[PDB]
Design a protein around this ligand. Structure first.
Ligand SMILES: Nc1ncnc2c1ncn2[C@@H]1O[C@H](COP(=O)(O)OP(=O)(O)O)[C@@H](O)[C@H]1O
Ligand SMILES: [Mg+2]
Length: 326
């Protein structure tokens, strides 16, 4: 048992992976919490090497079923007054954005229930207003969205400053192992339905940067921060949508791995300082908290080598052995 959690969410076959008639190699066992892969294709060889994690979500896994298993325990700790972080790992296209951001699916006006395709970000905000309005707590909710492209920090929330100013950041004398992002826009949310309008602003700004600087989302980290003031508790929840797993980006992810590895093994000299991403979330990983990681993979034999790497990263972060009968 640990405060660090590592789960794996496989994705179905997309039409493109179908269009080339690729065939699955990923086996998801949620009960045993295992996920296995093969090696040969038409050879149908005996390829063991099965992995075990804290939880496993198969191809039929639904969005709500991920929020309940992964986010609900963490949100309660945030409302209690702690800082937390949720991560999404994996090859571009596996489903980090579909898991962290969700969709809407053309169906028009939605009442007050969550969209079935919504992600962690839609659900977390709406559950924040519901749970804190129900227990009559006085609260204020403000969110922030920056983007780490090539290790320079960009705000996707500011309406002004249309191009791209690398935000400056320095350790604030106020709390150590903490930092302050000068100039970072902090949009204050009033209604729970406001979160959908904020994902629109940042989307274009992420697109405007993707076209006028080659700041494609696939090659950048996405940090969503929601802070909750309550009465006197302050809670923060960081939802990080990491860049695709596969000279400077491949270092920030390996740094984050070194951290979580160091966080799981109680080891000293965890090098938060080795990257901008780990330095920002330092106040969310050092101070004892609940950290969760979601590694998204593809079931096609097309992406065999990357699906193995991603699972390999997850094993390195929190190593747990496979138990009897693999
Ligand atoms: N669990 C899922 N259910 C349905 N569609 C999914 C799922 N995961 C991914 N997708 C689909 O795959 C794409 C989402 O990939 P994306 O989130 O961009 O990966 P990444 O964010 O890691 O680059 C979309 O085409 C979406 O339709
Ligand atoms: Mg994406």
């Amino acid at each position: 048992g640990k405060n660090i959690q590592v789960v794996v969410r496989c994705r179905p076959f997309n039409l493109a992976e179908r269009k080339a008639s690729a065939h699955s190699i990923v086996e998801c066992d949620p009960v045993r919490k295992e996920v296995s892969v093969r090696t040969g294709g038409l050879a149908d060889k005996s390829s063991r090497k099965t992995y075990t994690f804290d939880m496993v979500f198969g191809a039929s896994t639904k969005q709500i079923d991920v929020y309940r298993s992964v986010v609900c325990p963490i949100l309660d700790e945030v409302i209690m007054g702690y800082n937390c972080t949720i991560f999404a790992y994996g090859q571009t296209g596996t489903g980090k954005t579909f898991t962290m951001e969700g969709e809407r699916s053309p169906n028009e006006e939605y009442t007050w229930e969550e969209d079935p395709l919504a992600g962690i970000i839609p659900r977390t905000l709406h559950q924040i207003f519901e749970k804190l309005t129900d227990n009559g707590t006085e609260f204020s909710v403000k969110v922030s969205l920056l983007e780490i492209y090539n290790e320079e920090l960009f705000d996707l929330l500011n309406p002004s400053s249309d191009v791209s100013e690398r935000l400056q950041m320095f350790d604030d004398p106020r709390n150590k192992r903490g930092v302050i992002i000068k100039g970072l826009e902090e949009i204050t949310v009033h209604n729970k339905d406001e979160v959908y309008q904020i994902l629109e602003k940042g989307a274009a700004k992420r697109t405007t940067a993707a076209t006028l600087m080659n700041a494609y989302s696939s090659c950048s980290h996405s940090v969503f921060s929601v802070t909750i003031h309550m009465k006197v508790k302050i809670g923060k929840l960081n939802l990080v949508d990491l860049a695709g797993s596969e000279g400077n980006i491949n270092q920030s992810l390996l740094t984050l791995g070194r951290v979580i590895t160091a966080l799981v093994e109680r080891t000293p000299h965890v090098p938060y300082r080795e990257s901008k991403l780990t330095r920002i979330l330092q106040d969310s990983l050092g101070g004892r908290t609940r950290t969760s990681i979601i590694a998204t993979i593809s079931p096609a034999s097309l992406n065999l080598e990357e699906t193995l790497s991603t699972l390999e990263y997850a094993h390195r972060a929190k190593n747990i052995l496979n138990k009897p009968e693999v």
